[model samples]
Target: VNSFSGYLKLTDNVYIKNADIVEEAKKVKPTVVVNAANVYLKHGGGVAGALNKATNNAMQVESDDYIATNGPLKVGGSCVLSGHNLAKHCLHVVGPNVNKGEDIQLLKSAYENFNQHEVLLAPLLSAGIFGADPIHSLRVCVDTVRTNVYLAVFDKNLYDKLVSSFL
Candidate 1:
């Protein structure tokens, strides 16, 4: 497939429109699915939840028990190194909830430091309850020089806003 080293937007229909859209977005499967995670990989929710549904829905049980003893990771840390029943791998990044431009740094650090693969899939990092703001967070993601052409998936509504920004 033709490759590009920047953000590639994609979407899928699943209530929240959170599913494996890489196939639809890039017409190919990704080598990894980058999931937004808590510092310690605490309760599996948000992007984690969607990925859970996509796979076998058993990641929660495994992770819950796994975290009780392990507990939290550092900011910009990664866990769930295993792909589990998901894709090739799931890189869990802890995106700090901050904006005002500073959050961009955290996002950048998290993204740049994360494990990379030929093709990677991601949601709107830190945009949900993390409050990173999809557009701004995405700006940083796309701006970075990376090796993978990331598939940045978003809901239909948010997708409109993203495209609308160009108008």
Candidate 2:
């Protein structure tokens, strides 16, 4: 597994609720580690609100560098389908929430592309941030990317062992 500083830094915040998982990751030295995070929302915070906040927070910590450097990333064009030049190579796929079955298919298609090439650093799926439940969001991610690469959400506590085991 390649040890990149950004992974450590991003996972640090991701593991805030599940530090033990982070510890386990360190010990296991997996090729790819997944971190699932919660999307914080304030009153009146909608999907756009949450996304703006996430983008801003990511930019502040220099996390934007990863998206910028690793992206032109494709997000299945579910919502707000726009490419962020400032984010460099970031592709934000905005699919319907958990209730909509399209999210899984869209994610699957996106991952297929990622797996087809070695160029993608990571495929970040955003669902729970916009009020989607964690369990359901995770289910979609798992069902979609199961055969390919390991999946990681923003919340680090919920890594799917089944996916990691395959890797």
Candidate 3:
């Protein structure tokens, strides 16, 4: 298995703590992008409160932007939320759990979309405060997505580069 990680410092006054989404879509030039939805609020809320808040704020901004998920688009356990007007069209997917078969399904879905685009963005599935570890989370999320290019707000920088190269 391949792995990568890194940290990105905000160049301008962009507040990392309060800013919510990383705005990597806005920063880097790309045709398409995917981001992780706020899991803290959907799931049991605690531990990563600040991170979850940031995610919620970002989701509000990206409500109109395109969002994709591995299941139905609702506000419950592992569901993603977005603002009424800002969220993008969401892509809901139904796949096996991490232990069952998340990686294969994810990779297949992502590659299917890659045939027409230059880049693809996705969030760490089941990686947050849920049950999956960061490394395993990264693997499953990236492996399944379509494009070789992958972007994420959290995690280390080296990993982002490695994932991007795949795109």
lDDT of 1 by residue, 27-108 (tens): 4335666777776565456777666665566656666776787887767666756656556667777777664233456777
C-alpha root-mean-square deviation, each candidate: 6.1, 10.2, 10.1
- Residue 106: error of model 3 in Å? 8.4
TM-score per prediction, in order, is 0.70, 0.35, 0.38
**Candidates 2 and 3, the one with greater TM-score:** 3
Model 2, span 80-137: residue lDDT tens: 1221222223323344344443345554454333333222223245444443444544
What are the per-residue Cα lDDT tens digits for candidate 3 across 8-73?
322221111111223443343233433333322232232223323445545433433433324234
Residue 37 local lDDT, model 1:
77
lDDT against the true structure, each candidate: 0.59, 0.34, 0.35
Candidate 1 residue 60 C-alpha distance from true site, Å: 2.8
Better of 2 and 3 by lDDT: 3
Q: Which ranges of candidate 3 are over 4 A from the true structure? A: 1-21, 38-118, 157-167
In model 1, which runs have C-alpha deviations exceeding 4 angstroms?
2-29, 64-71, 99-104
Better of 1 and 2 by lDDT: 1
